[PDB]
Design a protein around this ligand. Structure first.
Ligand SMILES: O=C(O)CCC(=O)C(=O)O
Ligand SMILES: [Cl-]
Ligand SMILES: [Cl-]
Ligand SMILES: [Cl-]
Ligand SMILES: [Co+2]
Length: 298
């Protein structure tokens, strides 16, 4: 059940506990939660941002709700204020929706960066490792997680009705098993140097090392990319979806105009921690993969 469809149409939707249970069980099992009727409307004064020329550099436009800081775009202060307001509203609406849908996580949901992506996917071309037309779980070389989950909310805001074309791959445990013969330990001392030199924000844990290896080696495995089990799904304009992108294999093939919000969640806040990439990797390699993990005496 790679995609679980929900009826909720509002960012303030009321959920029964039965729907909450369906959502958390599906999310933690590695399904995409799909809300075809959950549109994120833009204000008239924001429609001008549906324009790829707002991107000023190599990265997409980003907003940090914790610090109220907008990056990746240049321009007049007034335009930057409006664009910050758009991404801040996305941060607020997604955060409220997640608290309505996932009370089990309580206050453990920690918001991270908002992304606005106005460039058409089908014209993109990057290095193999950065090429998100290749199935991957999310792992970012400059930003180790220390084991925390990467939970993402996505909304297709295309104003011409164009879908966002994804592919969704096989379960994480099967992906890990497929790539296990290709995994290797880090070179001794290298991660410490990456930290000392400011290449990584924080220290890259062994977990983050292996997630990066899965991400990178999986993208370079051309036979796996072509032949592994996967479903193609078009997320319609005006829809929203929610997914642990560190667990669900995903790729994007085409589309334009997306809002995305990242949240972090500690593994011990999950309903079924044993389903997390951290615990699956720790079991598969029989070792502790994050030295900063808490210790449970019993
Ligand atoms: O742009 C998209 O639709 C998805 C890209 C992706 O791989 C991600 O956001 O993690
Ligand atoms: Cl539903
Ligand atoms: Cl100005
Ligand atoms: Cl090291
Ligand atoms: Co991704």
């Amino acid at each position: 059940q790679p995609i679980i469809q929900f009826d909720a149409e509002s960012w303030e939707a009321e959920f029964t506990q039965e729907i909450q249970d369906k959502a958390i069980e599906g999310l933690e099992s590695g399904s995409v939660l799909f809300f075809p009727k959950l549109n994120f409307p833009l204000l008239t004064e924001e429609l001008k941002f549906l324009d790829p020329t707002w991107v000023s550099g190599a990265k997409n436009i980003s907003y940090d709700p914790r610090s109220a800081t907008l990056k990746g775009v240049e321009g007049k202060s007034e335009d930057l204020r409006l664009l910050s307001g758009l991404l801040k509203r996305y941060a607020e609406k997604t955060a409220a929706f997640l608290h309505l849908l996932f009370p089990f996580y309580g206050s453990s949901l920690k918001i991270a960066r908002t992304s606005f992506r106005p460039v058409e996917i089908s014209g993109r071309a990057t290095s193999a490792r950065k090429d998100d037309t290749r199935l991957h779980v999310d792992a970012f070389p400059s930003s180790p997680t220390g084991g925390e989950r990467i939970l993402r909310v996505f909304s297709n805001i295309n104003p011409q009705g164009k879908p966002r074309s994804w592919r969704i791959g096989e379960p994480f445990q099967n992906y890990l098993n497929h790539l296990l013969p290709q995994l290797s330990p880090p070179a001794p001392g290298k991660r410490f140097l990456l930290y000392l030199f400011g290449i990584t924000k924080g220290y890259r844990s062994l977990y983050d090392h292996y997630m990066l290896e899965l991400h990178d080696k999986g993208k370079l495995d051309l036979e796996y990319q072509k032949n592994s089990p996967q479903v193609a799904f078009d997320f319609p304009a005006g829809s929203t979806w929610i997914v642990f992108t560190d667990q669900v294999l995903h790729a994007v093939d085409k589309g334009q105009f997306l809002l995305e919000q990242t949240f972090h969640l500690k593994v011990n806040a999950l309903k079924h921690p044993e389903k997390s990439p951290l615990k699956l990797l720790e079991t598969a390699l029989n070792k502790k993969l994050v030295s900063s993990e808490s210790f449970k005496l019993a």
